[PDB]
Amino acid sequence: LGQPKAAPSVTLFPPSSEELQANKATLVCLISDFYPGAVTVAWKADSSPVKAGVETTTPSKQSNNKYAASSYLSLTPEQWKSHRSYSCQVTHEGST
């Protein structure tokens, strides 16, 4: 014990261009700077839960005693332009 808790950082990047050229799309959400190694990423499409093609792990960054996380949401490019920008939810301890 003794390590203070830290709020996880939210960094959601929009789908890049070189991945959106052909029929391909991938949403990347970066979560890091959190001590408790327990986090589940949930994706939503305009207040609608979507869990089609999502994977998330909780590895260790370095000796900084904190962990990281990464999630990838793969879908079709037509599905991206059919709605607004997606949102990345952390659900580490509260709504973020």
Partner: protein, 218 residues
């Protein structure tokens, strides 16, 4: 000095033979029992069998009697671990241990460096680098530029910036095993918003098993 050196990482496909080695030096390789311990990712240690360098006296685990064979070469002081008809569940970390100067004959006080053994039905494929454009529509905060490495079978992938420059700010995240067997990681760098593309902000991704040199800016 007593030390145990093992072979490099071996990555094969199910249904193919594999024979890793682990050489020990610094001691008389005729009286110390050599063994192998399996460690699955996220699981505990699993003992398979032990061997004797003097004569072939092999005592295998009841769950690994005919599933794996162990051999050694006393002439060169090197122990081997041969496999036959590998399966999808055989991917794990394997070590080579030896008894110490004190304790029982199966104490295994010393260990090796570890050999990464992974098996999968997917084949090698060159990664495609996708430059992750920063939040150009919302510059509130700090800019973050990076590239997306995807569609690559081998796990070890080194990513640098400006041929190794920009040490501060870059944070490489480990990849994730997708359903198709291909990994995907992401590396970004925290830069000020007023410094969009200072010199070049160019990605550098290297892939040794495929020999693909991809350099791209963003």
């Amino acid at each position: 000095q007593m030390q145990l050196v093992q072979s490099g990482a071996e990555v094969k496909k199910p249904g193919e033979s594999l024979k890793i080695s682990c050489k020990g030096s610094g001691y008389t390789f005729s009286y110390y029992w050599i063994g192998w311990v399996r460690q699955m990712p996220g699981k505990g240690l699993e003992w398979m069998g032990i061997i004797y360098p003097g004569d072939s006296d092999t005592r295998y685990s009841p769950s690994f009697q005919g599933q794996v064979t162990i051999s050694a070469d006393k002439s060169i002081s090197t122990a081997y671990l041969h496999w036959s008809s590998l399966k999808a569940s055989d991917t794990a970390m394997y070590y080579c241990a030896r008894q110490g100067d004190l304790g029982d004959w199966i104490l295994l006080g010393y260990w090796g460096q570890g050999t990464l053994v992974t098996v999968s039905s997917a084949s090698t494929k060159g990664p495609s680098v996708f430059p992750l454009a920063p939040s150009s529509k919302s510059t509130s905060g700090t800019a973050a530029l990076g590239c997306l490495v995807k569609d690559y079978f081998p796990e070890p992938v080194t990513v640098s910036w400006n041929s190794g420059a920009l040490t501060s700010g870059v944070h490489t995240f480990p990849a994730v095993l997708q359903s198709s067997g291909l990994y995907s990681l992401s590396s970004v760098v925290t830069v000020p918003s007023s410094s969009l593309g200072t010199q070049t902000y160019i990605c550098n991704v290297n892939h040794k098993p495929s020999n693909t040199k991809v350099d791209k800016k963003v």
